[PDB]
Amino acid sequence: SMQDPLADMLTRIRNAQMAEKTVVSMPSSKLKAAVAKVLKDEGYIADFQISSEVKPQLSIELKYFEGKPVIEEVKRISRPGLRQYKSVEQLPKVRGGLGVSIVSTNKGVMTDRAARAAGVGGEVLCTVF
Amino acid sequence: ATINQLVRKPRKRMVDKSDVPALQNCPQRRGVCTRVYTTTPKKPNSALRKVCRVRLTNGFEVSSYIGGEGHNLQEHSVVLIRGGRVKDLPGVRYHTVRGSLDTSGVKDRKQGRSKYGAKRP
RNA sequence: UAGUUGGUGGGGUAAAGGCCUACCAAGGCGACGAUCCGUAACUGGUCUGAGAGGAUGAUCAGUCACACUGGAACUGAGACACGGUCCAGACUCCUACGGGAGGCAGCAGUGGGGAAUAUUGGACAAUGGGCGAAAGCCUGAUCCAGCCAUGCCGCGUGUGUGAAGAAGGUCUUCGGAUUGUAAAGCACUUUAAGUUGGGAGGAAGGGCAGUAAGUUAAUACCUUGCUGUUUUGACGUUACCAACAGAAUAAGCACCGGCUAACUUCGUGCCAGCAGCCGCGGUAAUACGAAGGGUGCAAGCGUUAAUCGGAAUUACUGGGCGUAAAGCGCGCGUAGGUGGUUCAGCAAGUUGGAUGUGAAAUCCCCGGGCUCAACCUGGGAACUGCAUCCAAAACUACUGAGCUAGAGUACGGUAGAGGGUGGUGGAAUUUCCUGUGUAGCGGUGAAAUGCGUAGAUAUAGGAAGGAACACCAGUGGCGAAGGCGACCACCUGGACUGAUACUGACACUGAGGUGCGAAAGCGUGGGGAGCAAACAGGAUUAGAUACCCUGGUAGUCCACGCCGUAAACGAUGUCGACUAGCCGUUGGGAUCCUUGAGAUCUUAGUGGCGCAGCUAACGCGAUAAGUCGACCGCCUGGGGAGU
RNA sequence: GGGGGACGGUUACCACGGAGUGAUUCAUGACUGGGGUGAAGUCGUAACAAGGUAGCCGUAGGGGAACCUGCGGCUGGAUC
């Protein structure tokens, strides 16, 4: 009985970049398949595939610019039981604008740089460096 | 502790109390004296400290301390006590202002005269 | 909690209502904390803080509540009325003894309390109120003075030159060093304070006269423009300006061992004394008392009292629980918290916007006035809020439909000290009976108490009775935990493993509440082999209640009921998901050449090492203390005290 | 004269005061139970090394006092 799916996608990513894996495969959803699209366009993974029929999977390939990986830390903000909501003024900035922060707004899941341009607040998900 | 416990029982900040329990929220206090002992300090010192016991206008019967180098304090004479915790003696929690009402300060003193109440030559 | 909670009928009040009454009905509130106890006027704001917050409600402003104590109404637009009325009480005073009088929580003032808080001022000129509008009259609210280093801000207490580096002081290796250009000496300067002269602004009006407009039937009156003339200031010796005197009129306070800026001599010798903590003082003290010197601040400096910081030391932002304090003894489960996956709807959360509001002051920003500043003041932002509308639809909620990965059922199949109720064994111990046999047995560092010819120990035969269950037996099993080992029947719970169909999220955790709880102990009844607290004797011993020795009762055993704690231990809450390896072992399927002392792989347990990683360290390391989620319990210095 | 009004009378409501029985809170009390401290003193030597009988936790019984013994549990147990 797992209570939160999206803090389990991020846990497998953080663990596989210490076993120095390349491909990671977890079950999918219509939210996890949209978060990995955002991490690809910002650029942290190689690609992703939704390839099955009745238990649809998510196969993510990871990057290594060095022996050190490209993602160095990631934490879940709106843990189920806290539900962090932010307007555009109080919306956070990670590392002076060098990390990414993923905010579920009225116009779809987009990063903090995009919704602040459109002026739409919403709900934070994570703070990836 | 999780958030859903602190909603049910919030964090209650613990409180202190005054190290000077008598003279309730006031800087000085007068009292008449009863006895002038001369007690001995604790172990690592060796001396003979001079201690008077005062009955205030609150009705409390607390011991006090007398500084300086020589006191004219015969019994049934009013004083004016103030706080101050002497580490050496046990049970002593109050000093005594010199030169205020009856204690009349010290004599032949030329360093720090506003303490102990001495004039200017 | 019984006008208590509703209903009905009637009253009552400016006005809805148990506001009140008569019957009807038996409701209402409460663990989201009612009721009761203890304290306290709330708010805009002030004080700290980077912020989140934390304390606190002096002066200024809004609201409430009282006017010696307890009642009560009248009058009236509006009081259940601070200088009104009636009553009762307490307390002062008057009296011809019959009776009366009074209420500073208005401004001053006295007494008292206390560490502690001001003059029995000046006026109506200003702004305002009340009455009359006809001027005027009242005003201890206002506007002004007096007192108090009670606070913030500003200015003085002279400036330059001057080394014989003077006396004088202190220290010294006796050479000097230092106080020090500091003085003295010389040349200038005069703000403030003192003295003299001058001198605004706060003044708008009112009176009187004249004139022009509109009122009218009558520019008679009156109202209004305007003109002319006359009169007004408590402050007040006003701010401000000019002149005169002359360097004259004017500096303390704490500290100097470390935190902590700044040091050496002289007294004193565990004395006196010092202290915010560390701690100094027993004869050389950079800590006590002095003297020079020096550092901090200044018209102030120090101590005490009291809040917030530092304190991530109640941790929302921002901590912890293997051994430092801290995981309930273990389950099941109500309220509550959280929710796998596809569509569709909806718009309660959420985001964006608009309007109404959030008193003025205060804080902040840009300006403007007082010679500057404090102070005064114009414009903006802000006041994080709450409410009403409009739109968006990702996520959560709600609603409608599905899907099978969680979870559960049906079917084969194994393994087990998992329970309960009876039954039956064999070895050994003891008591008893009987034969043979005859001097010690037993015990201990060594002995003694004890047991023995009244025939013991030994030895053989027999009987009775009680409890425990060698070997197998193992880091081995099972159980939620405590616990569970003879064999068989009898009922009876759950786990594993395989195949296959079905239900289609039916799940997780759990304050309160419900259960099962080693051993010792307690109650009534059984039963009495050994063992054995209490106890008795011997020995050891300065002494020995103790260890050691010989005895020995409750108890241990069974049935029924109780108690509820343990180092109740993995000193580690339950549940779910990912993360290098290697060697063992229980049970179960696989695949596999087949003879295997087979092989490899996969789940469910149970052990030994180990890389990343974490950790104060020790050490854990797919059975985490690693990386992350959901809910619960608990910790806040040591004693006092789990009292 | 009626009407109406006043004053008296009387009932309702109500303050003071008086009665009984309770709670709760301070103030104090002959004698008693512990605790903390101190520096002198007497009795012992329980614990820390296998502390000289391995310690501790629960429970019962006993004893000048630390403590001793019984039953069960524990390693936070050292020698091999």
Side-chain angles (χ1 to χ4, degrees):
Chain A
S1 174
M2 60 184 293
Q3 302 292 112
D4 190 80
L6 196 141
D8 189 72
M9 183 187 75
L10 297 175
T11 307
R12 298 188 185 188
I13 293 167
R14 195 189 302 116
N15 291 320
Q17 290 182 356
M18 294 300 170
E20 294 293 327
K21 303 296 289 182
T22 302
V23 290
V24 185
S25 68
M26 74 288 290
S28 175
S29 65
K30 70 178 182 289
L31 182 58
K32 295 176 182 179
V35 172
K37 187 186 265 79
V38 177
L39 291 177
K40 185 183 75 174
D41 295 334
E42 298 293 326
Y44 293 102
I45 62 170
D47 274 324
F48 68 103
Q49 290 84 20
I50 303 168
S51 297
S52 177
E53 62 278 18
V54 294
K55 299 178 181 65
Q57 300 298 105
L58 183 61
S59 298
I60 295 173
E61 185 178 3
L62 301 171
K63 291 172 68 176
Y64 299 106
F65 175 69
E66 295 293 323
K68 277 78 66 178
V70 181
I71 293 170
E72 293 85 3
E73 74 272 15
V74 47
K75 64 176 285 188
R76 176 69 179 273
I77 297 300
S78 177
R79 45 184 292 271
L82 189 62
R83 299 296 186 186
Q84 193 66 256
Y85 293 104
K86 290 295 195 289
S87 69
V88 179
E89 293 291 328
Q90 292 295 321
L91 194 64
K93 177 188 282 188
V94 288
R95 306 296 181 89
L98 299 174
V100 292
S101 297
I102 301 171
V103 178
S104 302
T105 66
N106 300 323
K107 301 173 184 178
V109 173
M110 64 185 71
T111 179
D112 51 355
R113 299 173 180 181
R116 184 176 291 167
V120 178
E123 177 179 359
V124 185
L125 292 177
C126 64
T127 64
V128 182
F129 177 72
Chain B
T2 57
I3 308 299
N4 205 4
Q5 299 182 1
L6 297 174
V7 173
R8 194 185 301 121
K9 44 175 184 176
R11 289 182 180 270
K12 186 70 175 176
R13 178 251 183 83
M14 68 290 197
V15 298
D16 284 332
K17 66 181 290 183
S18 297
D19 53 355
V20 178
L23 58 155
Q24 48 271 9
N25 197 356
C26 63
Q28 281 74 238
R29 181 66 63 186
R30 76 162 59 91
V32 68
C33 60
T34 297
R35 179 62 62 193
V36 183
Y37 301 106
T38 51
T39 185
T40 67
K42 288 184 187 294
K43 185 175 176 66
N45 287 323
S46 292
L48 187 65
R49 295 279 180 262
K50 290 183 285 188
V51 167
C52 68
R53 178 174 288 273
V54 178
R55 186 182 63 84
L56 297 178
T57 61
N58 296 318
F60 293 165
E61 186 74 25
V62 291
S63 296
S64 294
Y65 185 76
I66 301 169
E69 288 85 5
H71 66 285
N72 55 4
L73 192 67
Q74 188 265 328
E75 294 86 4
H76 295 279
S77 298
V78 295
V79 295
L80 188 69
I81 75 168
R82 65 175 173 85
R85 180 69 173 84
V86 174
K87 188 180 182 295
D88 199 2
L89 301 170
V92 173
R93 290 186 177 96
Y94 304 104
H95 288 85
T96 294
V97 180
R98 305 298 297 271
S100 182
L101 269 295
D102 188 76
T103 54
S104 297
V106 296
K107 59 186 70 64
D108 191 76
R109 180 166 176 84
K110 292 181 181 181
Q111 289 179 353
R113 296 94 42 85
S114 67
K115 300 179 182 180
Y116 309 107
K119 298 300 290 181
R120 186 178 62 181

